[PDB]
RNA sequence: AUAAACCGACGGUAUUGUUCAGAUCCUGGCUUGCCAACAGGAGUUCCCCGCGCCAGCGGGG
Protein backbone atom coordinates (compact mmCIF):
# COMPACT_ATOMS: atom_id res chain seq x y z
CA UNK A 1 0.00 0.00 0.00
CA UNK A 2 1.14 3.55 -0.78
CA UNK A 3 0.67 6.69 1.31
CA UNK A 4 1.10 9.88 -0.70
CA UNK A 5 0.99 13.67 -0.66
CA UNK A 6 -0.65 14.93 -3.83
CA UNK A 7 -1.34 18.38 -5.24
CA UNK A 8 -4.04 18.75 -7.89
CA UNK A 9 -3.73 21.94 -9.98
CA UNK A 10 -6.49 24.47 -9.18
CA UNK A 11 -7.68 24.29 -12.82
CA UNK A 12 -8.63 20.67 -12.15
CA UNK A 13 -9.77 21.21 -8.58
CA UNK A 14 -12.87 23.24 -9.45
CA UNK A 15 -15.68 20.84 -8.60
CA UNK A 16 -15.80 17.74 -6.40
CA UNK A 17 -16.49 15.45 -9.35
CA UNK A 18 -13.28 16.50 -11.09
CA UNK A 19 -11.16 15.39 -8.15
CA UNK A 20 -11.11 11.61 -8.48
CA UNK A 21 -10.34 11.77 -12.20
CA UNK A 22 -7.08 13.66 -11.79
CA UNK A 23 -5.78 11.15 -9.27
CA UNK A 24 -7.08 8.29 -11.41
CA UNK A 25 -4.86 9.40 -14.27
CA UNK A 26 -9.73 2.20 -6.83
CA UNK A 27 -7.83 4.27 -4.26
CA UNK A 28 -8.59 6.57 -1.33
CA UNK A 29 -8.09 10.30 -0.84
CA UNK A 30 -8.88 13.03 1.68
CA UNK A 31 -8.65 16.77 1.05
CA UNK A 32 -6.32 18.61 3.42
CA UNK A 33 -6.66 22.07 1.89
CA UNK A 34 -5.91 21.25 -4.01
CA UNK A 35 -3.86 19.56 -1.30
CA UNK A 36 -4.76 15.91 -0.83
CA UNK A 37 -3.63 12.74 0.90
CA UNK A 38 -3.53 9.70 -1.37
CA UNK A 39 -3.77 6.08 -0.28
CA UNK A 40 -3.28 3.83 -3.28
CA UNK A 41 -2.54 0.22 -4.15
CA UNK A 42 -0.03 1.48 -6.72
CA UNK A 43 2.69 4.13 -6.53
CA UNK A 44 1.46 7.58 -7.64
CA UNK A 45 2.54 12.23 -11.52
CA UNK A 46 0.50 14.13 -14.11
CA UNK A 47 0.67 17.79 -15.13
CA UNK A 48 -2.82 17.90 -13.65
CA UNK A 49 -1.80 15.98 -10.51
CA UNK A 50 1.65 16.69 -9.09
CA UNK A 51 3.07 14.35 -6.44
CA UNK A 52 4.88 15.97 -3.52
CA UNK A 53 5.78 12.72 -1.76
CA UNK A 54 4.88 9.03 -1.67
CA UNK A 55 4.72 2.92 0.69
CA UNK A 56 3.45 1.34 3.92
CA UNK A 57 1.87 -1.78 5.40
CA UNK A 58 1.54 -1.42 9.16
CA UNK A 59 2.47 -4.04 11.74
CA UNK A 60 -0.18 -2.95 14.22
CA UNK A 61 -1.10 -4.92 17.34
CA UNK A 62 -4.17 -5.96 19.31
CA UNK A 63 -5.52 -3.72 22.06
CA UNK A 64 -3.54 -0.66 21.01
CA UNK A 65 -4.84 2.93 21.34
CA UNK A 66 -4.69 5.11 18.22
CA UNK A 67 -5.84 8.58 17.20
CA UNK A 68 -8.13 8.58 14.17
CA UNK A 69 -9.75 10.89 11.64
CA UNK A 70 -12.39 10.04 9.07
CA UNK A 71 -14.63 11.87 6.63
CA UNK A 72 -17.80 9.94 5.87
CA UNK A 73 -21.33 10.15 4.50
CA UNK A 74 -23.64 8.87 7.27
CA UNK A 75 -27.08 8.45 5.71
CA UNK A 76 -30.49 6.80 6.02
CA UNK A 77 -32.75 5.47 3.25
CA UNK A 78 -36.52 5.66 2.76
CA UNK A 79 -32.95 8.73 -1.14
CA UNK A 80 -29.78 8.65 0.95
CA UNK A 81 -30.75 11.23 3.59
CA UNK A 82 -28.09 12.45 6.08
CA UNK A 83 -27.83 11.50 9.75
CA UNK A 84 -27.75 14.81 11.62
CA UNK A 85 -28.26 13.70 15.23
CA UNK A 86 -25.06 13.42 17.26
CA UNK A 87 -26.24 10.16 18.81
CA UNK A 88 -27.04 8.67 15.41
CA UNK A 89 -23.66 9.69 14.03
CA UNK A 90 -21.65 8.09 16.83
CA UNK A 91 -23.80 4.96 16.69
CA UNK A 92 -23.32 4.91 12.92
CA UNK A 93 -19.55 5.05 13.33
CA UNK A 94 -19.22 2.17 15.78
CA UNK A 95 -21.60 0.11 13.66
CA UNK A 96 -19.65 0.55 10.43
CA UNK A 97 -16.46 -0.08 12.38
CA UNK A 98 -18.01 -3.39 13.37
CA UNK A 99 -15.68 -5.49 15.48
CA UNK A 100 -12.46 -4.02 14.11
CA UNK A 101 -12.16 -1.58 17.00
CA UNK A 102 -14.13 0.20 19.71
CA UNK A 103 -14.77 3.94 19.84
CA UNK A 104 -13.25 5.17 23.09
CA UNK A 105 -13.92 8.85 22.37
CA UNK A 106 -15.07 10.72 19.27
CA UNK A 107 -16.14 14.19 18.17
CA UNK A 108 -18.46 14.35 15.13
CA UNK A 109 -17.89 17.56 13.18
CA UNK A 110 -20.94 18.28 11.02
CA UNK A 111 -18.99 19.58 8.02
CA UNK A 112 -20.35 22.09 5.52
CA UNK A 113 -22.30 20.52 2.61
CA UNK A 114 -20.44 19.71 -0.62
CA UNK A 115 -21.59 19.65 -4.25
CA UNK A 116 -26.81 16.02 -5.93
CA UNK A 117 -25.81 16.95 -2.39
CA UNK A 118 -23.28 15.24 -0.11
CA UNK A 119 -23.39 15.91 3.63
CA UNK A 120 -19.98 14.94 4.96
CA UNK A 121 -19.14 14.44 8.64
CA UNK A 122 -15.59 14.28 9.99
CA UNK A 123 -15.17 11.90 12.92
CA UNK A 124 -12.18 12.67 15.10
CA UNK A 125 -11.10 10.83 18.23
CA UNK A 126 -9.29 7.76 19.51
CA UNK A 127 -9.72 4.01 19.00
CA UNK A 128 -8.28 0.83 20.43
CA UNK A 129 -7.54 -2.07 18.09
CA UNK A 130 -9.90 -4.99 18.59
CA UNK A 131 -9.56 -6.90 15.31
CA UNK A 132 -6.22 -6.06 13.67
CA UNK A 133 -6.63 -7.58 10.21
CA UNK A 134 -10.29 -6.53 9.99
CA UNK A 135 -9.18 -2.96 10.65
CA UNK A 136 -6.76 -3.01 7.71
CA UNK A 137 -9.41 -4.18 5.25
CA UNK A 138 -11.68 -1.44 6.54
CA UNK A 139 -8.94 1.11 5.86
CA UNK A 140 -8.07 -0.27 2.44
CA UNK A 141 -11.73 -0.40 1.43
CA UNK A 142 -13.01 2.76 3.08
CA UNK A 143 -16.11 3.54 5.13
CA UNK A 144 -19.51 4.70 3.91
CA UNK A 145 -21.08 5.91 0.64
CA UNK A 146 -19.81 8.71 -1.62
CA UNK A 147 -16.37 7.14 -1.24
CA UNK A 148 -15.16 8.85 -4.41
CA UNK A 149 -16.17 12.27 -3.09
CA UNK A 150 -13.29 12.40 -0.62
CA UNK A 151 -15.22 10.47 2.03
CA UNK A 152 -14.31 7.10 3.50
CA UNK A 153 -10.59 7.47 4.13
CA UNK A 154 -9.67 6.38 7.65
CA UNK A 155 -6.48 8.00 8.93
CA UNK A 156 -4.69 6.53 11.94
CA UNK A 157 -2.02 7.84 14.30
CA UNK A 158 -0.38 6.70 17.56
CA UNK A 159 -0.20 8.75 20.75
C1' A B 1 -15.89 83.41 -62.99
C1' U B 2 -16.10 89.45 -57.95
C1' A B 3 -9.73 95.88 -58.15
C1' A B 4 -11.08 89.72 -60.09
C1' A B 5 -7.79 85.96 -62.59
C1' C B 6 -2.39 83.80 -62.66
C1' C B 7 0.34 84.54 -57.61
C1' G B 8 6.39 81.59 -51.76
C1' A B 9 8.80 86.73 -48.38
C1' C B 10 12.82 84.45 -49.04
C1' G B 11 18.22 82.49 -47.79
C1' G B 12 22.76 82.21 -43.15
C1' U B 13 23.17 82.13 -37.42
C1' A B 14 26.02 78.36 -29.45
C1' U B 15 23.87 83.07 -25.33
C1' U B 16 28.08 82.17 -23.36
C1' G B 17 31.99 81.59 -18.88
C1' U B 18 32.09 82.06 -12.62
C1' U B 19 29.10 80.66 -7.63
C1' C B 20 27.91 76.41 0.44
C1' A B 21 22.35 79.03 2.13
C1' G B 22 24.36 78.97 6.57
C1' A B 23 24.78 78.91 12.14
C1' U B 24 21.11 77.97 17.25
C1' C B 25 16.34 74.72 19.06
C1' C B 26 12.03 68.65 24.52
C1' U B 27 6.13 69.08 21.88
C1' G B 28 4.92 68.78 26.69
C1' G B 29 1.86 67.50 31.33
C1' C B 30 -3.47 64.33 32.83
C1' U B 31 -6.88 59.53 31.40
C1' U B 32 -10.92 51.35 33.10
C1' G B 33 -13.69 50.68 27.27
C1' C B 34 -17.22 48.97 30.17
C1' C B 35 -21.85 46.01 31.67
C1' A B 36 -25.63 40.92 29.39
C1' A B 37 -25.06 35.79 26.30
C1' C B 38 -26.19 26.98 25.40
C1' A B 39 -24.19 26.92 18.86
C1' G B 40 -27.72 25.08 19.19
C1' G B 41 -31.64 23.63 16.02
C1' A B 42 -33.01 21.11 11.37
C1' G B 43 -32.67 13.92 8.56
C1' U B 44 -34.34 16.36 0.98
C1' U B 45 -29.63 13.52 -1.45
C1' C B 46 -30.21 14.04 -7.93
C1' C B 47 -28.93 9.45 -9.95
C1' C B 48 -27.46 3.89 -11.55
C1' C B 49 -27.12 -0.54 -8.63
C1' G B 50 -27.34 -5.33 -5.08
C1' C B 51 -30.20 -7.91 -0.72
C1' G B 52 -34.03 -8.01 2.03
C1' C B 53 -39.46 -9.12 6.27
C1' C B 54 -41.11 -2.86 2.46
C1' A B 55 -38.88 -1.15 7.66
C1' G B 56 -34.52 -0.18 5.63
C1' C B 57 -29.03 -2.06 4.71
C1' G B 58 -24.93 -2.05 1.10
C1' G B 59 -21.13 -1.31 -3.36
C1' G B 60 -19.92 1.97 -7.65
C1' G B 61 -20.32 7.76 -9.67
Swiss-Prot record:
Q: Please give the biological process terms from Gene Ontology that the record holds.
A: CRISPR-cas system; defense response to virus; RNA processing
What's the superkingdom here?
Bacteria
The effect of residue 20 to A is: Loss of pre-crRNA cleavage
Q: What induces it?
A: Repressed by H-NS, activated by LeuO. Activated by the BaeSR two-component regulatory system, possibly due to envelope stress. Part of the casABCDE-ygbT-ygbF operon.
Q: Which InterPro entries does UniProt cross-reference here?
A: CRISPR-assoc_prot_Cse3 (IPR010179)
Q: Which Pfam families match?
A: CRISPR_assoc
CDD domains recorded = Cas6_I-E
The annotated consequence of gene deletion is:
Loss of resistance to bacteriophage lambda infection, loss of plasmid silencing. Decreased levels of crRNA, increased levels of pre-crRNA, prevents pre-crRNA cleavage.
Is Cell membrane included in the keywords of this UniProt record? Answer: no
Q: Which UniProt keywords apply?
A: Antiviral defense, Endonuclease, Hydrolase, Nuclease, RNA-binding
Q: What is its EC number?
A: 3.1.-.-
Q: How is the cofactor bound, in the record's words?
A: Does not require a metal cofactor.
Q: Give the Gene Ontology MF terms in alphabetical order.
A: RNA binding; RNA endonuclease activity
**Entry's Gene Ontology cellular component terms:** protein-containing complex
The function of this protein is:
CRISPR (clustered regularly interspaced short palindromic repeat), is an adaptive immune system that provides protection against mobile genetic elements (viruses, transposable elements and conjugative plasmids). CRISPR clusters contain sequences complementary to antecedent mobile elements and target invading nucleic acids. CRISPR clusters are transcribed and processed into CRISPR RNA (crRNA). CasE is required to process the pre-crRNA into single repeat-spacer units, with an 8-nt 5'-repeat DNA tag that may help other proteins recognize the crRNA. This subunit alone will cleave pre-crRNA, as will CasCDE or CasCE; cleavage does not require divalent metals or ATP. CasCDE alone is also able to form R-loops. Partially inhibits the cleavage of Holliday junctions by YgbT (Cas1). Yields a 5'-hydroxy group and a 2',3'-cyclic phosphate terminus.
Q: Which family does it belong to?
A: Belongs to the CRISPR-associated protein Cas6/Cse3/CasE family. Subtype I-E/Ecoli subfamily.
Record note on quaternary structure: Part of the Cascade ribonucleoprotein complex, with stoichiometry CasA(1),CasB(2),CasC(6),CasD(1),CasE(1)-crRNA(1). Interacts directly with crRNA, CasA, CasB and CasC. Stable subcomplexes of CasBCDE-crRNA and CasCDE-crRNA also form, both of which are able to bind target dsDNA, and CasCDE is able to form R-loops. CasCDE and CasCE complexes have endonuclease activity. Interacts with YgbT (Cas1). Binding of target ssRNA or dsDNA causes a conformational change in the Cascade complex.
This chain's protein is named CRISPR system Cascade subunit CasE
Amino acid sequence: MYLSKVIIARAWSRDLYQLHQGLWHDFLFHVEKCHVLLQSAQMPSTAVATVIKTQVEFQLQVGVPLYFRLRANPIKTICRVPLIKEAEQIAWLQRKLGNAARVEDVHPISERPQYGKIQTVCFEGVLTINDAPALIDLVQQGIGPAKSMGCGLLSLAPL
